Amino acid sequence: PIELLPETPSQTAGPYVHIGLALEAAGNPTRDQEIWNRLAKPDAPGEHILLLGQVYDGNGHLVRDSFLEVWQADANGEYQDAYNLENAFNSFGRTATTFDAGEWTLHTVKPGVVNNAAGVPMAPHINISLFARGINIHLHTRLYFDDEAQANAKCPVLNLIEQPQRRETLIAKRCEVDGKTAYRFDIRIQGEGETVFFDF
Amino acid sequence: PIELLPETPSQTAGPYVHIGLALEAAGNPTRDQEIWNRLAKPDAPGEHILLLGQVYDGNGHLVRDSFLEVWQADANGEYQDAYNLENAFNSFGRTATTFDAGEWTLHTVKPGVVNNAAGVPMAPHINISLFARGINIHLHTRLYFDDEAQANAKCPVLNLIEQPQRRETLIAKRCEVDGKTAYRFDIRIQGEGETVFFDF
Amino acid sequence: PIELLPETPSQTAGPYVHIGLALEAAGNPTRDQEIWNRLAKPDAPGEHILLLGQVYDGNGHLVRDSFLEVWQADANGEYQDAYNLENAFNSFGRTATTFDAGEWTLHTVKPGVVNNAAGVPMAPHINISLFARGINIHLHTRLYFDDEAQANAKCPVLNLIEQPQRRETLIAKRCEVDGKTAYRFDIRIQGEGETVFFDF
Amino acid sequence: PIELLPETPSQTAGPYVHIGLALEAAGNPTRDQEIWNRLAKPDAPGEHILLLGQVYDGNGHLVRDSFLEVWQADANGEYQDAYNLENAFNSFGRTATTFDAGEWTLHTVKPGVVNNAAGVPMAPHINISLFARGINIHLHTRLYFDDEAQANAKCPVLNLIEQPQRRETLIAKRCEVDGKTAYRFDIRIQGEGETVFFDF
Amino acid sequence: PAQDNSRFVIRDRNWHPKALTPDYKTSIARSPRQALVSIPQSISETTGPNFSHLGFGAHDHDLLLNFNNGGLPIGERIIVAGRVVDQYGKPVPNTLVEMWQANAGGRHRHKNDRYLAPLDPNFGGVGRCLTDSDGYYSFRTIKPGPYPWRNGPNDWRPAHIHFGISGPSIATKLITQLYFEGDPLIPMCPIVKSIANPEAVQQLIAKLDMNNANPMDCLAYRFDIVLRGQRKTHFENC
Amino acid sequence: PAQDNSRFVIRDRNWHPKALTPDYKTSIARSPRQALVSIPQSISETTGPNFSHLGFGAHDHDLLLNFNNGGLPIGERIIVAGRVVDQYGKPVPNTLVEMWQANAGGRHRHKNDRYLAPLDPNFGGVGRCLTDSDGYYSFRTIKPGPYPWRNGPNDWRPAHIHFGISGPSIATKLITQLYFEGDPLIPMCPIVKSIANPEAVQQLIAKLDMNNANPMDCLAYRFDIVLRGQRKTHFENC
Amino acid sequence: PAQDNSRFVIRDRNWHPKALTPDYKTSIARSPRQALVSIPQSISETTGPNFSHLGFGAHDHDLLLNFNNGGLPIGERIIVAGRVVDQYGKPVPNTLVEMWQANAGGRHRHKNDRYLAPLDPNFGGVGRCLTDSDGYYSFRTIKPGPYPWRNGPNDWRPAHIHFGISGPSIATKLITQLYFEGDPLIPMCPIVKSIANPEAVQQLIAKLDMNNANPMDCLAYRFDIVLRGQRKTHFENC
Ligand SMILES: [Fe+3]
Ligand SMILES: [Fe+3]
Ligand SMILES: [Fe+3]
Ligand SMILES: [Fe+3]
């Protein structure tokens, strides 16, 4: 068969992942421009939400050194690739869980509907990439919202998961923190209630 | 040492196993003579029973595409190997679980007692072989009856299983389906309450 | 692929082929029972014919050391395999060309119609095998008759030859020698008017 | 020495060459635009001629499945490489011999004079490429005209052929088909009167 | 009735594929975590059904004619023949060989197959043959095509025909798959790679049989099946 | 009009198949007994047609849709892609690549094909594509099946697609055949064996391209064509 | 009468010697220029003569006694034995094996043999044997000597015995030559070199059989003959 150049192998982000990718969370001084957890500025269009969650290992214990990267569309269902800190909205962001803050946070807007390759509309989602020590190659997952039940049942990606019980793990539960709209998304890497991870 | 010709390796039955071994269940037209779930005809000697069960995987979910083959003795404790659809009893039969019927059924008579190689009597049992997608080499097991407690305690095969809690998995619970005597045998392939599988 | 035992390679019959297969023609004393050119005894059923012909090389010169073997059906279109010299007719025969007789002869009856594998009737023919020095592997050919023009045009074997001009080489011209029905069949191994040879 | 990438090996056009390069001749429906035997449209400059010929194998039999490609200059001696079906003249064209029409035809104008690399004028010629089953690598040849005797005697390409009797094979005889000027060019692939084939 | 007079050679579970083979995704939840309990052979294990009296139809082995809705299937006409022998080389006569496959495009005649390649209106994909006195079986069918499946993002099953062989007992019963000679998809399939030993993968590859091919008609493939060795009982119970 | 500014590398007639190859029967009467006359390259040989202005239809390269009589063809959906380069490695842009084949069963849509495998009512078997700026071409079709032919008593052509490539000149024009990876019928075919060097047979074998395959849809094969090297004229006529 | 129930494995004409082999001079004018026409096997080709009812003399296989003019021949007394099997390894019973050779000095009992080595008044050179139930044949003869021939200026044929085997049909009928183990003239002979493959020449070499030799009497040579594989018809005419 036809053999291409092999891809560079993945390695764990390591315990000190924060020094290079999450400077503030590492307790080290920051640079002028940093890629962080504020995707939307207070003046951006769409429903403003706060996202939080915890990451659990196979023994039900907290992962206090995880690093997450998010990729989502805007309120109109468009991906803003040109990253700039002066923009009202950026599609990319970065968050993490520290020993002080065993919970990660993300300030953004609720994403609009985007279509797949075949033209079938997918439910409002947030693409997540999980990195940490002990994770050799990053884990890919999606975050869905509970108040979007109608769209969730019609999603071509969510319906690709054979068992309905496993589809519930990708769904974030709506709560309210200080009068602000919030959704909680806990990730269970291994064991009971194990979150669905993707390959693409 | 002495090496003989190697046995042909096993491969999974696959998801579409039904088109070749369970034609009716595949929603395809049948041939004149088929090997199915009716081992005993209404005028056959012995206590007529109905067997039914479900198959579970490691996450406690139903295996809706499993294929099962059974081998049992008659009421007098004899193995009728000469398969013919004109016979009042046939020792062999096949059954399956479909997406429509996630439960298999088998119409037979309760088997008699047969001795082992050493001349020791074994308890009334039905030999079962399980095939499905995800199962590389078929699984062997036995179905014992709960109302045969005295014989089950004396069985030379059942007593080869070290732990008593594992022997219980091979025992079918007596129930009633439409005023007819029935026995329920659920197979748990993996996990908590895992069914004992044999090698011979 | 599947490889079987290789066939024993062919070699030329050689110049002295006559000493072992044509004893009389070699000028050596014969044995009690010999396989020769009289397939039909004067009392056999069917139209009694005499066959003669010469064998030419690529330079138009005569081959005076050729050995031929024939295989044909009887007047009813049946192959008599059990060779016996007491039979009125035998399907097999042997002839040759010597330095004295540069022409071969064969006394037999005209063969009846036989069908092919598909059940399509072939025209009356005689299967010929040609052996000689310079011929490494024997040549297979068929003899057809000119007074059977209707059947010759409908023959599934004769119509397999692309060019009509080449089909005429397998057709023997009718003549009369001493008030006896005769057909002349000249074989041209190479060059102009080259006879069609088969592979099967 | 210096080795370059090897050229892809040639393979025969095969018997069914027509389904892909001569759709109409294959008895199949044509596409909107096809490359066929009409090089010149009625209103094109130059002397309009009709070319026709037959192809013979080594046994003097017709090659009823041959495919021919032609490349020629216009009346002014220029090569029109930009193929378009709207053009009054196209320097390229294809033709073929079928079982129905064992003769190919080509409608074009007589080509003008073109110089070689050395600046020496070549006689009016048509470059031909012959493809068919049995021909592993296509044969190149040229078609010269008999009424151009003066130019044919001076041609630097025609004079590269040592023997004068072989040059005559490349010369097309002038005839008349339906009051129209025609030239006959028969190709003999093998044998007596064999057509000169080129290598460049 | 059947008797206990035979013993079968113990299965080499390192030759056969293991239960847990991670690359074949569905095998993770469908494989025992506990070990198989080893039991001695008795009349229950050493006996099995005989199918000599089953009413076989005329075209049960001919997949080119057993479905038929006024036509012939599109695809490479092939003959799949071979012999069924045990580990000792002894032929296994009057045994049931069953087979199933996809069409020339890789589409099965099942409701769960949602693959975009069309169904052949003249092809079913089921076949059964009882072996002769020397253990020979034969089928006439079209060569199946590869098909994609939801395992990895770009996983493709090689061209195969599934096989089911009964044998003298339930201990000899086997379900396997036949693969075709030289198919480049064979070393890439996770189901094939579930078998660790490459010499074992070779037993599953059917070889082109030109000697068994019908000239101007159809090609042939040879596939020999080897079942567990059958021996007579000796020195048992002293 | 076209000009004489290019020279083409001389063909290696020992790499290419010879005219007389006895095992391929039809080549006996159709091969020159006399030697080819060697002539220098002139404007007649170094020029050739450009097909950039030809009116290509939308589905001219898509054999899955260019015939269509209310359906899709039965067979293994495949993409046949590759690059056309010269001996120097230089891409050949805006060139004509034409192809033809049999159906999944080995039957051509021609009156002379009397083979018993049925015709696919949704398959024609013709395709044409003009290469892009980098020399790339692509076709979408079904994998053809092998077919028997009257040569030897049991001769079978391997699965192939015939190819026709024009190139910059009539000197570069080529007709060849593409064969598929791992096909056991390749070392047995007399037409293939007409090529003496086995390294040359390798250039005709299209390799499985998993990287170019559309997941859950169709497989892909890579076939690169190398034409005669084109160089500029130097020190001619002094 | 005989019936059409058998099919024979197609001959490998690249294994057998070619018709045109220039070093063997006489083959130049006695070889076809045109290709052989391939025809399917019918009753004419699949049937053949059976010589079970032919009346063999008591000494027809014994060349030491079948000529006899009051004495024994001069030369190395040998037994030429072997078995006649087909390509499947199946024995060929009740078949006709005919053989001829020259004397110890390379002289044949024929009028055209003008070689200066004298004739042996007690040796003819002809033999015939009908194979038994297991396909075995046996001959008793003297080892023939080599002889020169008008081909090259110094050409010598190795020590050989010509053989003619009938088989179950005319499709299996073969004429060949047996050679002796270690003879240095074998790699030099043009008739032997008519065979391109050196493994094919090995099949014609008779090996010394000390086991089958008669102590204080005669030596023995083993020569097995392999005829075309015979198989039953299957899936014909549907
Ligand atoms: Fe580190
Ligand atoms: Fe499958
Ligand atoms: Fe000799
Ligand atoms: Fe072709």
Side-chain angles (χ1 to χ4, degrees), chain C residues 14-16, chain G residues 108 147 157 160 162 177:
Chain C
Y16 310 117
Chain G
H108 300 80
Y147 58 92
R157 286 300 331 276
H160 65 278
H162 294 265
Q177 288 177 51

Side-chain angles (χ1 to χ4, degrees), chain B residues 33 79 81 94 125 136 190, chain E residues 28 31 44 50 98 128:
Chain B
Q33 291 201 39
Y79 282 101
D81 60 331
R94 337 234 232 200
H125 66 279
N136 298 324
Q190 180 191 101
Chain E
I28 298 167
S31 54
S44 285
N50 182 279
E98 286 165 291
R128 39 137 93 130

Side-chain angles (χ1 to χ4, degrees), chain D residues 14-19 21-22 24-26 36-37 51-57 61-69 94-106 129-133 135 184-187 189, chain F residues 30 110-112:
Chain D
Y16 309 117
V17 55
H18 302 116
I19 66 177
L21 301 174
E24 191 185 84
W36 204 233
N37 72 355
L51 297 176
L52 60 328
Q54 286 174 315
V55 185
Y56 295 92
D57 62 35
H61 301 135
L62 292 167
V63 179
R64 303 179 165 277
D65 50 14
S66 72
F67 177 69
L68 296 81
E69 287 192 331
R94 337 234 232 200
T95 185
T97 63
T98 63
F99 275 74
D100 312 304
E103 189 177 78
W104 53 269
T105 54
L106 199 88
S129 292
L130 180 63
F131 307 83
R133 68 173 224 276
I135 300 173
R184 192 181 186 87
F185 189 58
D186 290 348
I187 294 173
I189 306 172
Chain F
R30 298 180 188 200
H110 198 296
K111 287 94 60 271
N112 289 171

Side-chain angles (χ1 to χ4, degrees), chain D residues 39-50 88-89 107-110 180-183:
Chain D
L39 281 74
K41 279 184 172 179
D43 59 300
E47 190 194 341
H48 286 252
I49 59 161
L50 164 63
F89 188 72
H107 305 267
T108 186
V109 298
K110 195 178 187 178
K180 179 77 173 301
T181 305
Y183 292 91

Side-chain angles (χ1 to χ4, degrees), chain G residues 73-155:
Chain G
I74 295 165
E76 318 171 27
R77 297 158 65 89
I78 53 159
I79 288 166
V80 175
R83 200 187 198 193
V84 184
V85 292
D86 79 353
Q87 298 179 267
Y88 289 103
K90 189 198 169 193
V92 186
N94 302 102
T95 219
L96 184 62
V97 182
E98 284 161 298
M99 66 88 104
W100 63 106
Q101 56 171 91
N103 64 31
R107 179 73 178 273
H108 300 80
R109 189 169 285 288
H110 195 292
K111 285 90 57 265
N112 294 166
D113 199 356
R114 309 315 317 145
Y115 184 37
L116 46 156
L119 276 166
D120 188 326
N122 295 110
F123 193 67
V126 200
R128 47 138 90 126
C129 173
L130 191 77
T131 57
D132 56 40
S133 315
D134 282 282
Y136 286 101
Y137 73 86
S138 59
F139 286 110
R140 199 210 210 178
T141 187
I142 50 141
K143 187 160 174 278
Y147 58 92
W149 59 304
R150 310 213 105 102
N151 191 62
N154 197 21
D155 279 347

Side-chain angles (χ1 to χ4, degrees), chain C residues 7 9 33 79 81 142 190, chain G residues 16 31 44-45 50 128 176:
Chain C
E7 183 190 9
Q33 288 195 40
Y79 283 100
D81 64 324
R142 277 184 178 206
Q190 179 193 100
Chain G
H16 280 281
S31 48
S44 300
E45 296 84 36
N50 175 261
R128 47 138 90 126
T176 190

Side-chain angles (χ1 to χ4, degrees), chain C residues 18-33:
Chain C
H18 302 112
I19 72 165
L21 302 170
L23 283 69
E24 193 176 81
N28 292 324
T30 58
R31 292 162 288 194
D32 296 312
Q33 288 195 40

Side-chain angles (χ1 to χ4, degrees), chain B residues 4-21 23 25-29 31-35 56-59 62-67 69 71 78-85 92 94 99-100 114-119 122 125 127 129 131-140 142 157 160-161 166 189-191 194-200, chain E residues 1-2 4 7 9-11 13 15-19 21 24 26-45 47-51 53-55 60 67 85-89 96 98 100-101 108-113 125-128 162 170-171 173-177 179 191-192 194-195 200 203-204 223-228 236-237:
Chain B
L4 263 39
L5 290 173
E7 183 192 3
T8 297
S10 172
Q11 289 288 264
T12 178
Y16 309 117
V17 55
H18 302 116
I19 66 177
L21 301 174
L23 283 70
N28 291 344
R31 296 161 293 202
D32 292 300
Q33 291 201 39
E34 289 287 340
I35 309 152
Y56 295 92
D57 62 35
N59 306 316
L62 292 167
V63 179
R64 303 179 165 277
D65 50 14
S66 72
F67 177 69
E69 287 192 331
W71 179 242
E78 293 187 315
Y79 282 101
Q80 301 311 305
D81 60 331
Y83 198 87
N84 199 322
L85 287 191
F92 188 74
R94 337 234 232 200
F99 275 74
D100 312 304
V114 285
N115 286 15
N116 70 354
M122 298 184 279
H125 66 279
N127 306 281
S129 292
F131 307 83
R133 68 173 224 276
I135 300 173
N136 298 324
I137 180 162
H138 59 294
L139 302 167
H140 300 284
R142 274 175 178 213
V157 177
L160 282 170
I161 304 163
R166 290 215 78 212
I189 306 172
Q190 180 191 101
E194 191 176 300
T195 313
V196 175
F197 298 115
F198 300 126
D199 188 22
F200 43 84
Chain E
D4 186 46
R7 285 301 169 263
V9 176
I10 306 305
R11 268 191 174 112
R13 290 181 183 270
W15 181 256
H16 281 281
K18 287 294 180 181
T21 57
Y24 175 23
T26 314
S27 85
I28 298 167
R30 298 180 188 200
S31 54
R33 287 299 82 121
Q34 298 296 308
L36 310 187
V37 178
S38 295
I39 60 165
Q41 296 180 14
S42 69
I43 192 171
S44 285
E45 295 88 31
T47 60
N50 182 279
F51 298 101
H53 303 129
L54 195 68
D60 276 6
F67 193 68
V85 297
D86 76 357
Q87 299 187 267
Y88 288 107
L96 188 61
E98 286 165 291
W100 63 103
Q101 57 172 94
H108 302 80
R109 191 167 282 284
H110 198 296
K111 287 94 60 271
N112 289 171
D113 199 357
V126 199
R128 39 137 93 130
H162 302 260
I170 57 154
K173 169 72 187 195
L174 194 75
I175 278 187
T176 185
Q177 288 177 42
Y179 300 102
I191 294 181
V192 171
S194 69
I195 306 171
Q203 258 195 100
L204 299 187
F223 185 62
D224 291 334
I225 302 145
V226 180
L227 301 180
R228 291 168 72 171
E236 278 196 53
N237 310 325

